[PDB]
């Protein structure tokens, strides 16, 4: 359950500033380590963020063509693993190409989605020697990934809260006659919310409710009575306001997110390759 989970306790952060601080500390720690052990080779935190967004997209694409059919909960767990890993680790030390595959592997194990290692690596569009090399790399990085997650493997995704909210709307909110029409767009918004840092800043229930209400507002429905009356928030004004600003900030995070650009990503990919070759 989320309300006493590790995700709530250790992986839900106050603001974007704390996340940027974690990423900057990771970047600076790698810079210090490389300077001591061993400058246009190094990457700044915003460049690391662009690379991380690119490879989160790569992980999503990998999971969306995985055979056998890969549960969406598994994909959410893997993407959460990726985000959490690169909160405290530099893409310059551990390559995101391997880390994302390790995240998918660990998520498949943790979610109880049973798949054999050769079956897993067969989904990679690489030659058999490449698949064996990738499997060896994943095996090397699995324990490292688990350690960097502080052994917090259960990830609470917003999809089940989304389903529960749909059940509640269909039962206790006759004003909205067919909550099913809210699904697609809400799911779409959910996808966009996944691309931001919202999974580290808000609860899965808050994210699901924000997606549903964004779908309702986009459809032209002001279903605020669900919050006021059905959710009891009429008696508590403080709770109502403290939820409304949460959804508003979530919408603003989705508004201010920018997808990585193509040739910019190419430049940073060359930079990362140089970082991992010179080392």
């Amino acid at each position: 359950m989320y309300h006493n989970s590790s995700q709530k306790r250790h992986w839900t952060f106050s603001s974007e500033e704390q996340l940027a601080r974690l990423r900057a500390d990771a970047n600076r720690k790698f810079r210090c380590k490389a300077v001591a052990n061993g400058d246009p080779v190094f990457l700044e935190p915003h460049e690391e963020m662009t690379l991380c967004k690119y490879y989160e997209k790569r992980l999503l694409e990998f999971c969306s063509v995985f055979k056998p059919a890969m549960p969406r909960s598994v994909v959410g767990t893997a993407c959460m693993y990726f985000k959490r890993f690169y909160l405290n680790n530099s893409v310059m030390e551990y390559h995101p190409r391997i880390i994302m595959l390790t995240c998918a592997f660990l998520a498949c194990k943790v979610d109880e989605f049973n798949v054999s290692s050769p079956q897993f690596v067969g989904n990679l569009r690489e030659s058999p020697l490449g698949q064996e090399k990738a499997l060896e790399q994943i095996l090397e990085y699995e324990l490292l990934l688990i350690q960097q997650l502080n052994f917090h493997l259960i990830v609470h995704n917003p999809y089940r809260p989304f389903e529960g909210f749909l059940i509640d709307l269909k039962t206790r909110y006759p004003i909205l006659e067919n909550p099913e029409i809210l699904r697609k767009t809400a799911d779409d918004f959910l996808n966009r919310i996944a691309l931001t840092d919202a999974y580290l800043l808000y609860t899965p229930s808050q994210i699901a409710l924000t997606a549903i209400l964004s779908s309702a507002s986009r459809a032209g429905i002001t279903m605020e009575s669900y919050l006021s009356e059905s959710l009891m928030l009429k008696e508590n004004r403080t709770c109502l306001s403290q939820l409304l600003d949460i959804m508003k900030s979530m919408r603003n995070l989705v508004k201010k997110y920018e997808p990585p650009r193509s040739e910019e990503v190419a430049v940073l990919k060359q930079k990362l390759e140089r970082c991992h070759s010179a080392e």
């Binding site: 006493n4 989970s5 109880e112 054999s116 095996l139 324990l143 688990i146 493997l153």
Partner: protein, 286 residues
Amino acid sequence: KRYEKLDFLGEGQFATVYKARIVAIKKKDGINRTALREIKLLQELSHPNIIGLLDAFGHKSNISLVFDFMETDLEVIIKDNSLVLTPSHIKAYMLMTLQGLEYLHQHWILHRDLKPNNLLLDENGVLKLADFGLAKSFGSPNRAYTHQVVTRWYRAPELLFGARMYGVGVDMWAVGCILAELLLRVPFLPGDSDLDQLTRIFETLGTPTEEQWPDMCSLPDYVTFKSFPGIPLHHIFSAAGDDLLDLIQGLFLFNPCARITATQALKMKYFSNRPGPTPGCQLPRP
């Protein structure tokens, strides 16, 4: 490492346990899925009657788990002929087991391996459920389960009939078996095979009908048995009180839905009637 090994506690088909400084460390596929299951579940649970995962470490694809050191388990208590299991002791063990199981079921997790040696006892007399290597989350309709779970002696008839979907009853039935083992000091239904396990169940508690199990015939591995009358419960457990008999009957109901849940079992008069459960410090120890 940070833990200095103290003693070798045991070796199993899945892992080996060492006492160390006090804690207990359990040492191309990758990291073992049993250890990963234990970590992922015990990190999300905190309750006095559930084994605590204090730490975890490892190297390469081997991983060691750190738990609190438990002095004994219920199997050693049951098999020890020099300890008398009074009604108060049995009630205390049952109470701790059911409280841990209620907490576990509230967080939508099935133990699926309940048995006397998986119910460990600390030095203070606190019973903790352990060996979560078969434990799984339940309540999701899109996820199928294996019927091989639970050691055969404590496996529920729905599991023995091939149920791929089940709830807390699979634990509850095992709890009932444990309760029976606490009263008779011997395994209640020691079947040599699945067929023999079902035979012993029906020979002791009668052959269920549709009146007691409205959809038993839908189970994939259901085979029509002989219509046994069973044995009355007061004949099996002569020293059992009426409240204890009601608890046993609820735990051993053939219908899993009708089978009492941990919450319902805790609310039964048996736990509220006299005598009260023994405090942990006064429970028997080998």
